[PDB]
Ligand binder design. Structure first.
Ligand SMILES: OC[C@H]1O[C@H](O[C@H]2[C@H](O)[C@@H](O)[C@@H](O[C@H]3[C@H](O)[C@@H](O)[C@@H](O[C@H]4[C@H](O)[C@@H](O)[C@@H](O)O[C@@H]4CO)O[C@@H]3CO)O[C@@H]2CO)[C@H](O)[C@@H](O)[C@@H]1O
Ligand SMILES: OC[C@H]1O[C@H](O[C@H]2[C@H](O)[C@@H](O)[C@@H](O)O[C@@H]2CO)[C@H](O)[C@@H](O)[C@@H]1O
Length: 628
């Protein structure tokens, strides 16, 4: 394998002797050169572990590195300052000051210019992180909400132009807000030029996807493949009009890119650099679990998949240090955490905590939640969880069967209950969600519906508002970067047109993808409305989280409350949080609190709480007690 010095000499060969001398003395090159030496070894090692002695590895690497230099050279000065800042502050992601929000530009603000006008609200809310859903060109009609990309360079015309996106990102930076977008690197739409040219037999795009002559291999692969959208098609393949079959983990119009082809890595690395120079701070690595296939395996979380992401990481460490990755692996907890690392994905969605928040509301028992916060919360240094309550996607019950078994709980039976409860098919349920992808051959099913709809706000359940504040309080204080599903802060309900919409009716996730509700937002400052109660409640926790250093970092120590309905944990050995998941008053005995100070200030209610006597929490009450 070649080394950093050798490759750098060849990168400079594109310059005339006179030009070369000038480049080598420039600041840009000095920085690039330094980063090459520091991070190239990792890049080479990761790529070698995946491609081995492939003849195209060296040629691809030099092409990519030449691109990396040009990209860094062109990179805007303001972005390079951010590169330096984060390069010397890897834990910026762990700061309690961070609070993120996510929205669809079209649903929330119409278009990019309209989004730009919403920035003042984002600052009002206190956001320092804004994640925007798929913005680029995609097939008209069904595109899996923009996740079927037909062009990584051209913005969806309905949203604006690439120029408007640049302006938006710069406006967010001016407002002290980081820009976060998806890096849909596991697949493209079947209308993408690469897909068309590959299928057409263009030699320049040979093996860019996984195409087969018949069902021989697809049937073999399907013996071990998990079905993501069983409603759309069985297994992981779709048939082309000409009779061939293509690997399609998700919708039939989404073709899995073939990373076993080094030129695919190079191609996508190029797209990553493009986004990088737009000033994107964080890239949501869509479907990281599926980027490597191997017959006989689930084709999820394979070693090469992890290696490739680490290879991508190195490319950013070299040509755009400010760009961090956000893993979005919704898989077994043991696999989820493997994507999180300083040299892989610095942050990642925490589906375990999210799924258990909802589980606890249904069961009223914090057992599983406590277990998770105790054994699966702390992460390696320089990494953090992205804690959330809801997202653009359905809710999956991704807790570990092995973990549940320890608690005497049958995963299969328990999920059946949860699914029934949240789709209002369980006596007394307050949830008003709808099913998603019920799989008759496995019994699996997921849930769609907004946070407000799932807690009973649709029917005006008197506990609805408190439930919302309770869930968000935990995502906001356990340690990690909290990501609010914009619209939740005012109690937005399900969209009630999706089921009638020809392009959405077969995807219930659209139920929880409502448009900006002018009426609810207009009530955010009115304490007598649910919108106001929710907004002020959440805004206060946001204010406290960001100004109080006791919430800093991502580490926590659980506290045994001795009450199966109350969750408890301590941050920095100075903040004791209690959360009552019961609709009835619940007590934490004075005996249980003997090690605590006689009195402590509750940052939530603002009152002084006595801990030398039984502490009774009202239904769904949350307390953030300063014990130090
Ligand atoms: O305040 C609301 C209700 O609270 C109480 O009922 C709770 C239970 O206390 C919880 O434990 C839970 O019960 C679920 C259980 O979590 C779930 O696993 C499932 O249990 C199955 C089990 O999986 C299966 O292996 C086998 O053992 O059968 C079990 C029973 O079907 O389903 C349980 C619910 O049926 O949630 C309920 C509901 O919140 C309290 O007892 C109620 O009176 C009260 O209304
Ligand atoms: O904050 C220290 C410790 O307090 C509690 O421990 C209790 C325990 O539950 C009782 O069984 C008894 O031993 O008194 C202890 C207090 O001195 C929490 O339960 C525990 O998690 C926490 O670490």
């Amino acid at each position: 394998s070649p080394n950093s010095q050798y490759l750098k000499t060849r990168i400079l060969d594109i310059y005339t002797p006179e030009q070369r001398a000038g480049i080598e003395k420039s600041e840009d090159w000095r920085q690039f050169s330094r980063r090459m030496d520091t991070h190239f070894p990792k890049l080479m090692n990761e790529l070698d572990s995946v491609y081995g002695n492939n003849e195209a590895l060296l040629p691809m690497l030099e092409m990519l590195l030449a691109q990396a230099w040009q990209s860094y050279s062109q990179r805007n000065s303001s972005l390079k300052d951010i590169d330096i800042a984060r390069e010397n502050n890897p834990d910026w992601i762990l700061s309690n000051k961070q609070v993120g929000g996510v929205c669809y530009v079209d649903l929330f603000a119409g278009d990019l210019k309209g989004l730009k006008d919403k920035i003042p609200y984002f600052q009002e809310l206190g956001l320092t992180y804004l994640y925007l859903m798929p913005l680029f060109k995609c097939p008209e009609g069904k595109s899996d909400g923009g996740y079927a990309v037909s062009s990584y360079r051209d913005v969806n015309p309905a949203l604006g132009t690439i120029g408007d996106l640049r302006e938006v990102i710069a406006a967010l930076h001016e407002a002290g807000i980081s820009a976060v977008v998806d890096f849909i690197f596991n697949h493209t739409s079947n209308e993408h030029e690469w897909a068309q040219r590959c299928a057409a037999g263009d030699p320049l795009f040979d093996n860019f996807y996984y195409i087969f002559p018949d069902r021989r291999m697809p049937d073999q692969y399907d013996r071990t493949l998990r079905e993501i959208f069983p409603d759309q098609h069985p297994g992981g393949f779709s048939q082309l009009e000409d009779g061939r079959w293509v690997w399609t983990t998700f919708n039939s119009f989404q073709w899995d890119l073939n990373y076993s082809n080094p030129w695919v890595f190079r191609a996508m690395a190029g797209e990553m650099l493009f986004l990088a120079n737009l000033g994107v701070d964080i890239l949501r690595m869509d479907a990281v679990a599926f980027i490597w296939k191997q017959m006989g395996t689930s084709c999820e979380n394979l070693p090469q998949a992890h290696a490739l992401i680490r290879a991508f990481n190195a490319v950013m460490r070299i040509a755009a240090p400010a760009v961090f990755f956000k893993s979005q692996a919704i898989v077994h907890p043991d696999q989820v955490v493997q994507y999180i690392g300083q040299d892989e994905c610095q942050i990642g969605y925490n589906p375990l905590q999210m799924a258990l928040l909802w589980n606890t509301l249904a069961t009223r028992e914090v057992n599983l939640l406590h277990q998770a916060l105790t054994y699966r919360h702390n992460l390696p240094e320089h990494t953090a969880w992205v804690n959330y309550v809801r997202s653009h996607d359905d809710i999956g019950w991704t807790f570990a069967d092995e973990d549940a078994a320890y608690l005497g709980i049958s995963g299969y039976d328990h999920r059946q209950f949860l699914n029934r409860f949240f789709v209002n098919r369980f006596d007394g349920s307050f949830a008003r969600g709808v099913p998603f992808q019920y799989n008759p051959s496995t019994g699996d099913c997921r849930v769609s519906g907004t946070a407000a709809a799932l807690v009973g706000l649709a029917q005006d359940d008197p506990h609805a508002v408190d439930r919302i504040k309770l869930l968000y309080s935990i995502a906001l204080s356990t340690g990690g970067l909290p990501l609010i599903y914009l619209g939740d802060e005012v109690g937005t309900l399900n969209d009630d047109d999706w089921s009638q919409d020809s392009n959405k009716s077969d995807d219930s996730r659209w139920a929880h993808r409502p448009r900006y509700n002018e009426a609810l937002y207009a009530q955010r400052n009115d304490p007598s409305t649910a919108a106001g109660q929710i907004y002020q409640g959440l805004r206060h926790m946001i204010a406290v989280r960001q100004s109080n250093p006791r919430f800093d970092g991502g580490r926590l120590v659980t506290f045994n409350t001795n009450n199966k309905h109350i969750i408890g944990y301590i941050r920095n050995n100075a903040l004791l949080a209690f959360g009552n998941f019961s609709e009835y008053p619940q007590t934490v005995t004075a005996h249980t609190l003997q090690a605590m100070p006689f009195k402590a200030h509750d940052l939530i209610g603002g009152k002084t709480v006595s801990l030398n006597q039984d502490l009774t929490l009202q239904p769904y009450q949350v307390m953030w007690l300063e014990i130090a």
